[PDB]
């Protein structure tokens, strides 16, 4: 069933992105909607694999060849890591924050995806949708957002 792949996804984004929070992992990933990002997915490294927490967090491990970059998802696979995402150049966004929260701002200014930042710097989660930044979210708020928005 589709709506199990997405319970599924949202579940592997929340454990791999609280267990990269509580590290200070960085962490970039891009969930694919309506949009196609297919050229974006092919600045990266090819998964095309099944999505779970583990392999998340195994991709964004520092100092290896899959973590410079965002991961990209589409339909129910891992499509891609070290992918390229425009960069935003608004000039609201905090200089506090990092390229990360540029890249996933910069693609959610052209896309409908739903992009989440695990920062380096703090450890907060954030997510860009249309242009828009939720900066540090909680567990409560990233649930909710992610069940509202990629679950159909
Ligand atoms: N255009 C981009 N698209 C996606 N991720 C990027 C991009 N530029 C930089 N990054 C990520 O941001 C990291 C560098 O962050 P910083 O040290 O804040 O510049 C890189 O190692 C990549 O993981
Ligand atoms: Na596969």
Same mark, same amino acid.
């Given at each position: 069933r589709?709506?199990?792949e997405?319970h599924?996804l949202?579940?592997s984004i929340?454990k791999? *992105?609280?267990?990269? &929070?509580?590290?200070?992992?960085?962490?970039?990933?891009s969930?694919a909607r309506?949009t196609?990002?297919?050229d974006?997915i092919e600045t990266?490294?090819?998964? #095309? &694999?099944k999505?779970?927490?583990?392999?998340?967090? #195994?991709?964004?491990?520092?100092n290896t060849?899959?973590?410079?970059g965002?991961?990209?998802?589409?339909? #129910?696979?891992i &499509?891609s890591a070290?992918?390229?995402?425009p960069?935003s150049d608004?000039?609201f966004?905090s200089?506090?924050?990092?390229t990360?929260?540029? &890249?996933?701002?910069?693609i959610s200014?052209? +896309?409908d995806?739903? *992009?989440?930042?695990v920062?380096?710097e +703090?450890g907060?989660?954030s997510? +860009?949708?249309g242009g828009?930044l939720?900066?540090?979210?909680?567990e409560?708020?990233?649930?909710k957002?992610?069940?509202?928005?990629l679950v *159909?």
């Amino acid at each position: 069933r589709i709506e199990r792949e997405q319970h599924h996804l949202i579940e592997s984004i929340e454990k791999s *992105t609280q267990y990269m &929070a509580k590290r200070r992992i960085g962490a970039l990933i891009s969930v694919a909607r309506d949009t196609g990002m297919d050229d974006y997915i092919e600045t990266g490294i090819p998964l #095309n &694999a099944k999505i779970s927490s583990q392999l998340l967090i #195994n991709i964004f491990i520092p100092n290896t060849p899959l973590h410079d970059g965002a991961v990209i998802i589409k339909g #129910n696979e891992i &499509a891609s890591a070290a992918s390229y995402l425009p960069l935003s150049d608004s000039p609201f966004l905090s200089k506090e924050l990092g390229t990360r929260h540029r &890249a996933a701002l910069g693609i959610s200014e052209v +896309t409908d995806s739903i *992009t989440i930042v695990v920062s380096e710097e +703090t450890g907060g989660i954030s997510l +860009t949708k249309g242009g828009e930044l939720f900066r540090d979210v909680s567990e409560e708020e990233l649930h909710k957002i992610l069940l509202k928005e990629l679950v *159909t």
